[PDB]
Design a protein around this ligand. Sequence first.
Ligand SMILES: C[C@@H](CN1CCC(Cc2ccccc2)CC1)[C@@H](O)c1ccc(O)cc1
Ligand SMILES: *[C@@H]1O[C@H](CO)[C@@H](O)[C@H](O)[C@H]1NC(C)=O
Lengths: 49, 444, 51, 46, 387
Amino acid sequence: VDLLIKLAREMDFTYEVHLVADGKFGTQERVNNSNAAAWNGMMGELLSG
Amino acid sequence: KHPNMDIAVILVGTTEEVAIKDVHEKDDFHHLPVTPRVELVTMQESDPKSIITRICDLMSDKKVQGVVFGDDTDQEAIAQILDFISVQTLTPILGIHGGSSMIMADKEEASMFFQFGPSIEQQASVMLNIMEEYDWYIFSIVTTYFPGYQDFENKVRSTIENSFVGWELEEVIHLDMSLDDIDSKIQNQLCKLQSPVILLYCTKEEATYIFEVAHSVGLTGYGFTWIVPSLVAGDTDTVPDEFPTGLISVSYDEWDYDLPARVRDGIAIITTAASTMLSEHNSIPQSKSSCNNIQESRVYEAHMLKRYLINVTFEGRDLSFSEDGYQMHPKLVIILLNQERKWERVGKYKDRSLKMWPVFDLYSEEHKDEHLSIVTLEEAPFVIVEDVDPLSGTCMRNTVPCRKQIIKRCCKGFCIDILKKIAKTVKFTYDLYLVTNGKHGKKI
Amino acid sequence: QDFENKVRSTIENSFVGWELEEVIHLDMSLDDIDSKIQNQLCKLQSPVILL
Amino acid sequence: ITGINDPRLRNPSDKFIYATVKQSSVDIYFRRQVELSTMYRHMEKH
Amino acid sequence: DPKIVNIGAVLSTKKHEQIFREAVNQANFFHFTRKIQLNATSVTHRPNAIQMALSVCEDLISSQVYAILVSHPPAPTDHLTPTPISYTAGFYRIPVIGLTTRMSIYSDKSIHLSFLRTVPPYSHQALVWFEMMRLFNWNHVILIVSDDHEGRAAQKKLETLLEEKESKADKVLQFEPGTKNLTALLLEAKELEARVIILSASEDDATAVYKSAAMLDMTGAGYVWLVGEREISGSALRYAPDGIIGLQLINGKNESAHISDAVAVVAQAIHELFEMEQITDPPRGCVGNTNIWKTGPLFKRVLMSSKYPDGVTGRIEFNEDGDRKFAQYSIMNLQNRKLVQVGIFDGSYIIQNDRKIIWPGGETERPQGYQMSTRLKIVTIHQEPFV
Ligand SMILES: C[C@@H](CN1CCC(Cc2ccccc2)CC1)[C@@H](O)c1ccc(O)cc1
Ligand SMILES: *[C@@H]1O[C@H](CO)[C@@H](O)[C@H](O)[C@H]1NC(C)=O
């Protein structure tokens, strides 16, 4: 967080933070067909946006 | 009041003109609320025109609400054709043998078609169980553009990712049989792969060409082994020897249950679905069969039937289907090409679990011959017996199976590893068990 | 094989760990429908070929 | 624990536990890597 | 001695049958008649699939056709009404060539392995969009697709185009057909920074798309719309937003030009074919033949490679799927709620017509995209030392 705000003073950006619903950061999982779903966890939030 | 359903069944082939007529349909399980009315017809050789014409011809005013198809043929295409009629009619059709049982493209959801062949996914699973049993970890896949590819590639991918073992997928090859080759492009690719265990997927006819080409490439010989799905083996009655010997593949067994028993299963499924649908809505399933005109009204209502028909049980036997229309878990047999033209059974496989007969050094090698069974005893650190995870059902990682007559125990350790490296280097296969009387040798 | 032999000595004597990957002998006689030459040649993965 | 490679790990025991989080990236190291692929399963327990 | 090599077709009307036979005769006259001759057979579209398939097996294949041509019927019934023929000929590997089927589901060689066409599918339209995206330098877009083989194929094609570049899935949005209200999904779309949109759907679906989009005022300026030929047409045209960018394939409506050209290609392919030996005639009649026709895949191979760049329809070359390559589309604009050609696209390069560019809402020229996001949504996990 201190790093993030350090950046925020350095960087033009503004920040709003929420912790990911899943306690896990992320891992690939779920269904077989094609490639299905996506890695559960905050990483998944990143791809999802 | 009296609810008598209308049903039709056809047999093609049978190696007879005067193919056995109406052997079945004899009242069984009459208790089921709807009684079957059956019309049986046979036709000698398959055609899109003959089949389409005849099935519509039987439709007439007759108004049949169900059809079962069966064939002596090895032909892949047939299932799709009848399926097409189903898409058009919304009249249920299924098949008990041969090509209709042979896999097909993913069925249209609105369409109703069923096959007594195993699911592609299921077959891939069985192929994997077979490789795991012989502990052949490293393998490649040769496929063709025929339908089910990538359902197969995906199924293998799913089945493979989950397992702990460090198996290797080496190559996956997709080659169009169309744009048939002067280039022997298949020869040019196939020549590349170095892997010992090959899964092939294609039409019955295609397997021949791929195999002649493999014979040119040198892929059929000496330590490499091939494993095949239902389609290539088909009926198993006719086997061009273009196929290499030692070829391993799964298929439904004729011996366990004969074709009329299977037809009985089909009829039972149709009338059970009719009985259950009756119980739910107290409504006659019977519908106008004629294809030429627009599909009969309230046939659009028929969707629920499929929904009912997916899982059906009679005779203490489950017919349960999968969304694709293959039966969820028909009994299956592991088969090999015995030397000469024989298709001789090797394994039985059912539901979750698989069982195979030969112990060691499965499958006439020019460099060397026979098989070696080995006995050991447990001592730490060198030879360690461990109890395998019951949930897994089979040994994990470095552990190699060993049996003790008294139960499967899992041996791993110094002797197991030294033996494993030695087996890898001298290139032979072996069966391992545990000693009973006196462990290490003793003189009295 | 005298070519092979000369190479075997020349390559062998040197300390360096260079690798001979394949040696292929194909008869031009008994000319091929099989493209047996294609069937052998396709196999080799090596960057440098002596013909 | 002598090393990343510990004979004590190499000599696993039901009596001596070695614990981790499933779906932790370490688990991805265990699954993705072939060389230690045998060793993964003992960790997977508990 | 002459040898009569039959061809067969299914076409909309008897007049077009006469056009077919005429083109065939032009092929005969202009190529050696001493060695070989071409003969023409054709039939009108039948009301169901079944009458037609029966027609192929009986009326056509009994004539030993070396190939079949097919066109969309006067009143389209459902879609892909030339579905059966591709299957029916396919059993014997008899090559089929569609004139009017822009449908994408025929692109997979697996299901239809005999299918070739003189028109590119709707999926291939993405070639334009990438080029369009290329010119304007918007790397950030949004894709809205219906859920079916059509939409998913379009997505795959565009994404594959993007794969050469760093893969760009700025966002992708899937909706299922026949759904009157799409509002929530677009509400999700606005949150995405990228302000340019591209969509593929059916006319009826497109009505609902524009209807829902106008409610949230996504038709406004700072937003861009790129679309398929189907979207601009029909009831969808009525509810369509201003300043939209749109596509129309050239000679898509005409069977006849495609007839003359397809038959020309068939002729070139055959004359090139008979140069080869170990040929076999196609099976005589459906009845009694359970076996494929070994030549058919070869006929397909030459026919896909068959050049003859000069044609009534434009350049002709075939992609791997048997789909046409280097086809030309005419870009369309919605100016004053009417269709106008802002430019025309031919070959791999777009061409700009003299007409002024229009963007949605009022713009003399306004290529605006992506905005910028002034906010960062940050995510974390509960880890004791760093959080
Ligand atoms: C799947 C087959 C075509 N397939 C669909 C049509 C069917 C014949 C039919 C006729 C009338 C009604 C229904 C069906 C025959 C089989 C083909 O694409 C293929 C075969 C093998 C292959 O590696 C790649 C593609
Ligand atoms: C040529 O086409 C006509 C149909 O117009 C047909 O009667 C005739 O048999 C065909 N000739 C051959 C050799 O197929």
